[PDB]
Each structure stands twice: as C-alpha cells, then as structure tokens.
Design an enzyme around this catalytic site. Sequence first.
Site, PDB file in Angstrom:
ATOM      1  NE  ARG A 178      -3.726   2.735   0.717  1.00  0.00           N
ATOM      2  CZ  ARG A 178      -4.703   3.206  -0.065  1.00  0.00           C
ATOM      3  NH1 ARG A 178      -5.243   2.443  -1.009  1.00  0.00           N
ATOM      4  NH2 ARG A 178      -5.142   4.454   0.090  1.00  0.00           N
TER       5      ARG A 178
HETATM    6  C1  LIG Z   1      -9.430   3.632  -4.788  1.00  0.00           C
HETATM    7  C2  LIG Z   1      -8.617   4.673  -4.010  1.00  0.00           C
HETATM    8  C3  LIG Z   1      -8.951   4.992  -2.682  1.00  0.00           C
HETATM    9  C4  LIG Z   1      -8.195   5.991  -1.964  1.00  0.00           C
HETATM   10  N1  LIG Z   1      -8.582   6.375  -0.676  1.00  0.00           N
HETATM   11  C5  LIG Z   1      -7.986   7.354   0.035  1.00  0.00           C
HETATM   12  C6  LIG Z   1      -8.499   7.782   1.314  1.00  0.00           C
HETATM   13  O1  LIG Z   1      -9.515   7.277   1.764  1.00  0.00           O
HETATM   14  N2  LIG Z   1      -7.811   8.802   2.002  1.00  0.00           N
HETATM   15  C7  LIG Z   1      -6.607   9.419   1.479  1.00  0.00           C
HETATM   16  O2  LIG Z   1      -6.039  10.231   2.177  1.00  0.00           O
HETATM   17  N3  LIG Z   1      -6.154   9.055   0.272  1.00  0.00           N
HETATM   18  C8  LIG Z   1      -6.773   8.076  -0.496  1.00  0.00           C
HETATM   19  N4  LIG Z   1      -6.369   7.699  -1.766  1.00  0.00           N
HETATM   20  C9  LIG Z   1      -5.179   8.405  -2.347  1.00  0.00           C
HETATM   21  C10 LIG Z   1      -5.655   9.813  -2.910  1.00  0.00           C
HETATM   22  O3  LIG Z   1      -6.265   9.646  -4.201  1.00  0.00           O
HETATM   23  C11 LIG Z   1      -4.497  10.813  -3.004  1.00  0.00           C
HETATM   24  O4  LIG Z   1      -3.407  10.163  -3.723  1.00  0.00           O
HETATM   25  C12 LIG Z   1      -3.998  11.192  -1.576  1.00  0.00           C
HETATM   26  O5  LIG Z   1      -5.028  11.324  -0.582  1.00  0.00           O
HETATM   27  C13 LIG Z   1      -3.214  12.489  -1.562  1.00  0.00           C
HETATM   28  O6  LIG Z   1      -4.071  13.629  -2.230  1.00  0.00           O
HETATM   29  P1  LIG Z   1      -3.687  15.089  -2.039  1.00  0.00           P
HETATM   30  O7  LIG Z   1      -2.198  15.184  -2.321  1.00  0.00           O
HETATM   31  O8  LIG Z   1      -4.549  15.818  -3.035  1.00  0.00           O
HETATM   32  O9  LIG Z   1      -3.949  15.540  -0.700  1.00  0.00           O
HETATM   33  C14 LIG Z   1      -7.028   6.679  -2.612  1.00  0.00           C
HETATM   34  C15 LIG Z   1      -6.720   6.329  -3.957  1.00  0.00           C
HETATM   35  C16 LIG Z   1      -7.481   5.369  -4.685  1.00  0.00           C
HETATM   36  C17 LIG Z   1      -7.089   5.165  -6.139  1.00  0.00           C
END
Ligand SMILES: Cc1cc2nc3c(=O)[nH]c(=O)nc-3n(C[C@H](O)[C@H](O)[C@H](O)COP(=O)(O)O)c2cc1C
Lengths: 199, 199
Positions: A178
């Site tokens: 992850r």
């Molecule tokens: C299916 C999927 C679920 C995700 N769930 C989360 C989540 O619940 N919380 C989170 O912080 N990032 C999650 N991410 C990663 C975010 O898309 C993003 O890469 C990350 O939060 C950082 O975004 P930011 O730089 O705009 O803050 C997920 C990505 C995918 C593809």
Amino acid sequence: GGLRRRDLPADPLTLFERWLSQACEAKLADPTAMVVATVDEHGQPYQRIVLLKHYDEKGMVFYTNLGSRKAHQIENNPRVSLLFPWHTLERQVMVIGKAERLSTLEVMKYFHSRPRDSQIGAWVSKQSSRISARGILESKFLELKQKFQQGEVPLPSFWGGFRVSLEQIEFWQGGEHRLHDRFLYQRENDAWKIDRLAP
Amino acid sequence: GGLRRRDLPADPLTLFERWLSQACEAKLADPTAMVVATVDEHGQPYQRIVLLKHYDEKGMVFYTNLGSRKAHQIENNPRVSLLFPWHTLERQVMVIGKAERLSTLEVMKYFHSRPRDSQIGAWVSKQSSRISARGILESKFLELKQKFQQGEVPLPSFWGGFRVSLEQIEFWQGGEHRLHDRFLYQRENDAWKIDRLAP
Ligand SMILES: Cc1cc2nc3c(=O)[nH]c(=O)nc-3n(C[C@H](O)[C@H](O)[C@H](O)COP(=O)(O)O)c2cc1C
Ligand SMILES: Cc1cc2nc3c(=O)[nH]c(=O)nc-3n(C[C@H](O)[C@H](O)[C@H](O)COP(=O)(O)O)c2cc1C
C-alpha cells in the site's frame, strides 16, 4: 514492477498514452471518461464526467453545451482539474490546466465526424437548466428527429468545446504494501520537472 | 424504467443508499470510491479519489493525512464536491457541501476498527510532500512494521477525517435516446427542493 523514476518517459503524454491504451485493452467502461472539476464565483467546486475526445501537447479536449453550468463556470474561472478514475486498474491520472474555447472550424470538424444520432441529440437539451418534466426532452427529440430527417444535421450555435492546457500531470499507481507510487510532472520553463510525492 | 420524479424518495440518501447497494451487488471496483474536489488559494481546483467510510444526514465522511494537500486546501476553503464515478452502471452522484474536521473520539474509534496493517501504513507517509526516492517509504515501513510489532498501533497525530455536509445532491442516470435523467436535491429551509435538470 512498480513505477520507478528511472523508467519514466520525458513527456508525460507518453505515459498517459500507454496507460490509456492499457485501459482500453482491459475493457474498462468509457476509458476516455474523465471527471472535470470547475469552480463557481463563490469558490465552490463542481464536478461531472465528460469524455476526452482528443489530446496532444497543447492539451486535452472535450465538447459540451455552451450554456451549461461548466461553461458558465469556466468563463468566470478558466482553471480546471481533470481526473481519470482508473482505480479498477489501481491508477489515477490528474491534469491541471486552463480551459480555452475551441474555434468553430475545430468544433464543426469534430461534430460532423460523429454518428448522426449524436449530432441530432446535441440540439435537444438546454443543458443544466431546470426543466419541469422529462416530456420536454422527448417532444423536442421527436421534432428534431423528423425536422432534420438527418439530412446532414447542422451545428447548434450553442455547441462547443474546450482544450485544457497541461500545466501539471500527476500519476498514481497502487504499490506494494500500500506504498503507492505518485509522480508529478510540472511544466516549468518549456520543460517538465518531475517529483515523486508521498502517498 | 428511467428515473421519474413521482418515484423519487423524499430523502436523497434513500436513493443514494439504493444506488450504492446496487453498485456493490454489481461488483464494481471500490463502490465507495469517490472523487473529492477541493480548491486552493488561487482558485485552482484539485482532485483525487478517497473512500466513503460513513454517511448519514449530517454528511459523508472520509479519512486522510492532515498534512496533505487536500487538508491544507480545505483549511483555506471548506467548500468541496464529491463525485461517485458509477458510469459503468450509467450513473453519477455528486454532492456539494462544506468539509468539517471530525473529533479525535470519532477518528480513534474508526481507526482502531480497521485492519492492523492499514493502521500501520497510516504512519508511513508524509502524504503529498515531495520525497527523493521510493526507498524512504520502504525503510520507514519496515521500521514501523517492527517497532510496533502491531501491539495495538497508536493513532498518528496527523491522521484525521472530514465530514462533508449535504447542501446539494445530484443524481444522473443514463436515459433512453441519450436523454439522460438528472435530479438535483437542494437543501432549503430544513427541507429538500427537487428539480429535474436538462442533460
Ligand atoms: C481507490 C482509491 C482509494 C483511496 N482512498 C484514500 C483515502 O480514503 N484517504 C486518502 O487520504 N487518500 C486516499 N487515496 C489516495 C488519494 O487519491 C491521493 O493520492 C492522496 O489522498 C493524496 O491527495 P492530495 O495530495 O490531493 O492531498 C485513494 C486512492 C485510490 C485510487
Ligand atoms: C460516461 C459519461 C460521459 C459524458 N460525457 C459528456 C461530454 O462529453 N460532454 C457533456 O457536455 N456532458 C457529458 N456528460 C454529462 C455530464 O456529466 C453532465 O451531466 C453535463 O455535461 C452537464 O454538467 P454541468 O451541469 O456541470 O454543466 C457525460 C456523462 C457520463 C456519465
């Protein structure tokens, strides 16, 4: 094999083309479907899916109704974000840029190259406006579907397109443990600066 | 059978619950995956996918790293948009609201109810910051994966959550003749005003 910097192409579109190609090959529904985010006069973002129709170094293109909410919002604030929801393949691609209107030459060209039933449907709806009943759409469709006979179906004056410039292109790919791989390409001085971002 | 006003439930969450249930039943990848759009200090929207973890009349909840870009953006502008990319089922749901931080009681509760390997991974990354190599993540993971032994893994002070209020909920469903059904529920005076929108 994860996503390592040493394997990244110099032009982000090379990577995007590869990923888009793999999405089509995996038969994802609407591989060209992307979520476009715009912002209204109050700082409120809005989102909706549209289809990517063409792209190159100048930007990504989609077509829409010029009286729609996304069009009104772009006219007030040209800054937009595009996201390809490819999580079924453990990937996301996000593009940041400015939306600019296409010329009628470009719009006419694309419009007359698409199926005739889609050309006809473009005339039907005053996209995004409140309507009192579904019947309004149905009646207009029947009318147009016969008034045109589909002779060649003309371009509605309210149909247009936008090209979103490529200021930033970010790639996300699921990683081992992850620990996801994220790379941000940022346009800087006629070149691309690449940085890995923490997941 | 299309989507007609006479069949709409009074509470939009009733319709959302039904659609979410059908998405799970159809085995879509990550049915709770939603695209969250935020806006920076310059009026630029940004997007990324997150998972919906809980929802009720007070709003939809997701968790994230408090030092991330989305968190910094929300602190400056709490207005956000959420979109469920369910086009494989010819549907979209969009929610407009304000993001508010959850209390530590709520965060701790949810955090300690999730698998232990996910609890451990939350400690690993300084989400969104530029990092010079993937190895930084890998080393930290190994360290934490042993330093904790996973005794009970504590809540990182930088882990939190946001609840997005339900100001507007819009439903889109593919329609016959490409005449799509769109309904906007807008919170007004402790009630919901419903309008069909042209596609
Ligand atoms: C299916 C999927 C679920 C995700 N769930 C989360 C989540 O619940 N919380 C989170 O912080 N990032 C999650 N991410 C990663 C975010 O898309 C993003 O890469 C990350 O939060 C950082 O975004 P930011 O730089 O705009 O803050 C997920 C990505 C995918 C593809
Ligand atoms: C898979 C898919 C593709 C779509 N493609 C387009 C498109 O290319 N152009 C468009 O105007 N609307 C398209 N829509 C409809 C939009 O999501 C939205 O309902 C419409 O453009 C009006 O948005 P607005 O009111 O924010 O302006 C599509 C919807 C789906 C689910």
